[PDB]
Swiss-Prot record, chain A:
UniProt induction comment: Down-regulated in the pyramidal cell layer of CA1 in the hippocampus by global ischemia.
Entry's family note: Belongs to the glutamate-gated ion channel (TC 1.A.10.1) family. GRIA2 subfamily.
Protein encoded by which gene: Gria2
Post-translational modification: Palmitoylated. Depalmitoylated upon L-glutamate stimulation.
Location of this chain's protein in the cell: Cell membrane; Postsynaptic cell membrane; Postsynaptic density membrane
UniProt organism field: Rattus norvegicus (Rat)
Domain notes: The M4 transmembrane segment mediates tetramerization and is required for cell surface expression.
Note: The postsynaptic actions of L-glutamate are mediated by a variety of receptors that are named according to their selective agonists. This receptor binds AMPA (quisqualate) > L-glutamate > kainate.
Main function: Ionotropic glutamate receptor that functions as a ligand-gated cation channel, gated by L-glutamate and glutamatergic agonists such as alpha-amino-3-hydroxy-5-methyl-4-isoxazolepropionic acid (AMPA), quisqualic acid, and kainic acid. L-glutamate acts as an excitatory neurotransmitter at many synapses in the central nervous system and plays an important role in fast excitatory synaptic transmission.
This protein's name: Glutamate receptor 2
Coiled-coil stretches noted in the UniProt entry, renumbered to this chain: none
Assembly mode: Homotetramer or heterotetramer of pore-forming glutamate receptor subunits. Tetramers may be formed by the dimerization of dimers. May interact with MPP4. Forms a ternary complex with GRIP1 and CSPG4. Interacts with ATAD1 in an ATP-dependent manner. ATAD1-catalyzed ATP hydrolysis disrupts binding to ATAD1 and to GRIP1 and leads to AMPAR complex disassembly. Interacts with GRIP2. Interacts with GRIP1. Interacts with NSF via its C-terminus. Interacts with CACNG2, PICK1 and GRIP2. Interacts with GRIA1 and SYNDIG1. Part of a complex containing GRIA2, NSF and NAPA and/or NAPB.
Tissue spec. comment: Detected in forebrain. Detected in dendrites of neuronal cells. Expressed in the pyramidal cell layers of CA1 and CA3 and in the granule cell layer of the dentate gyrus.
UniProtKB/Swiss-Prot annotation, chain C:
Subcellular location: Cell membrane; Postsynaptic cell membrane; Postsynaptic density membrane
Comment text on domains: The M4 transmembrane segment mediates tetramerization and is required for cell surface expression.
Other comment: The postsynaptic actions of L-glutamate are mediated by a variety of receptors that are named according to their selective agonists. This receptor binds AMPA (quisqualate) > L-glutamate > kainate.
Name used for this protein in its record: Glutamate receptor 2
Similarity comment: family membership: Belongs to the glutamate-gated ion channel (TC 1.A.10.1) family. GRIA2 subfamily.
Post-translational modification: Palmitoylated. Depalmitoylated upon L-glutamate stimulation.
Function: Ionotropic glutamate receptor that functions as a ligand-gated cation channel, gated by L-glutamate and glutamatergic agonists such as alpha-amino-3-hydroxy-5-methyl-4-isoxazolepropionic acid (AMPA), quisqualic acid, and kainic acid. L-glutamate acts as an excitatory neurotransmitter at many synapses in the central nervous system and plays an important role in fast excitatory synaptic transmission.
Tissue note: Detected in forebrain. Detected in dendrites of neuronal cells. Expressed in the pyramidal cell layers of CA1 and CA3 and in the granule cell layer of the dentate gyrus.
Subunit structure: Homotetramer or heterotetramer of pore-forming glutamate receptor subunits. Tetramers may be formed by the dimerization of dimers. May interact with MPP4. Forms a ternary complex with GRIP1 and CSPG4. Interacts with ATAD1 in an ATP-dependent manner. ATAD1-catalyzed ATP hydrolysis disrupts binding to ATAD1 and to GRIP1 and leads to AMPAR complex disassembly. Interacts with GRIP2. Interacts with GRIP1. Interacts with NSF via its C-terminus. Interacts with CACNG2, PICK1 and GRIP2. Interacts with GRIA1 and SYNDIG1. Part of a complex containing GRIA2, NSF and NAPA and/or NAPB.
Residues of the full protein shown: 25 to 191 of 883
Amino acid sequence: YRSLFQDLELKKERRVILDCERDKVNDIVDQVITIGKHVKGYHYIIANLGFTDGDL
Amino acid sequence: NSIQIGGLFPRGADQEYSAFRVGMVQFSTSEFRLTPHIDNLEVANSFAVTNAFCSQFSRGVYAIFGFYDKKSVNTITSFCGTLHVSFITPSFPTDGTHPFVIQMRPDLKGALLSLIEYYQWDKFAYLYDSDRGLSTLQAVLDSAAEKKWQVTAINVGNINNDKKDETYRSLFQDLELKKERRVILDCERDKVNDIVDQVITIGKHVKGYHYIIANLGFTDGDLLKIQFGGAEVSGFQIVDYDDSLVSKFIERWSTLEEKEYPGAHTATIKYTSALTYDAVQVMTEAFRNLRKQRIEISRRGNAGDCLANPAVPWGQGVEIERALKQVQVEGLSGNIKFDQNGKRINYTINIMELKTNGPRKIGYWSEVDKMVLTEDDTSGLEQKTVVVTT
Amino acid sequence: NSIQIGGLFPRGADQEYSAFRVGMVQFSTSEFRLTPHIDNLEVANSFAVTNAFCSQFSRGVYAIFGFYDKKSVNTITSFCGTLHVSFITPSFPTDGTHPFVIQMRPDLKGALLSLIEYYQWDKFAYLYDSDRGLSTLQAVLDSAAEKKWQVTAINVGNINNDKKDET
């Protein structure tokens, strides 16, 4: 993910749409909290019916 | 000689008690084997301190070991200075030069005030736990008006454990009223990692911020969680793991049984556990020198009641206080030399910075040999300050 | 009833001991006359505190009176909260709400932080004796960052009595 998110910061995407299960979402959500790039400016979209089932 | 010593320990400090027993394995010589009167009692209640104290005072022990609270700082410095029994601790030093008080924690505010002058700050936030006293707060405020600094000093120990998540959002957003990119944290490694996770809660650990941890346990924190967060973390770790004397201890420490000795099998170690093992080296070298000087101190329970009015003690412990201060040994915390008051001297504090590759030394600080930088082969984060000739 | 009470007093506080006896003249009713176990001892040494304490604890007294040092703040709040004997003092209050601790000094930092807002200050010098604790220093610093104040806080109790003119 540090290989992936720093490649995402080559284009610096403030617009991320995640399409995973609520375990695999919260894996990637914690990787965003790992790199710490969940500050204002970014926008995130979870693409399952379990929006409240994540780590809100 | 079965030398009766003290065995006070706060409850939950069993890793320090584990390294206490490692010193009881390594430093129990054939000349004498030490006899600990183990009192795993509380530390905040001085009633719990006094009953463990006056029981060992009824034993006639010669060197009491443990910690002390900021409540029990004036219990230990009052009775031990009066009842002529030396006390050894890894806790924070006392401002008053009290007799019979030996203490394993070297003074950090000399390197700390020198560190802020290195980073050349003028206004910074200073969150602090008041449980180790406010003498470090008195140090940064006396240098605030001296070097024209604007300290944002807010206590954090007043926050109860019930709601210590919304109070930080009240606190950090008030810290973002002035937007402090310069935060110095003065807490224990549990209370540091509480506040560190509150920084990760608000997410303001990005580049631009700077953080300073103000204890000797810099590697004892949560380094991996904000190793790649973006901000710059700079601290002090006295346990130099690069030393072979430290590493061969870890080769004995990390191979211990974790079930038998709790918190031992991990390769990392608390500095309080390291200062505990260093204290046994000083205590053994003392009674080896009492065996060399042949000052026979054979005391039964003649001290006895600590409520004797007046309680006049046996005066041979004054030389035992002196012979502790005459011990100059090495160890896990470098050279261990004492003054005439029990404060550690001729030490060297290693300035440690958390980087992308992890913790990294940039310099060392001794008490009179001040902050001299240590070599800076910047292989990781390869920027190397491009020389522009003209 | 000859009610045994405490009689701890720091040495040199005899004017307070004088008004203590005026209360022993005025407020000694016919129902009961109080019995002070007078201990005019030191206040900095907790050993001197404990022997005067545990003697009256051997008496079985009901209300111990005196002062306390910032050294003996954690001697009184530890034993009296444990040994279930109430203590009365005119000394400065404790930050921790300890049991069996009664104290005659009302909190001044509420009027003090309100007074600086009345004079509308922004930068001031704050010399202080640390012997009454640093809770008043904690009050003015928590209102320093609150009201954007620049406190010049320098301790003065560290100055010894030998050279307290050139310092």
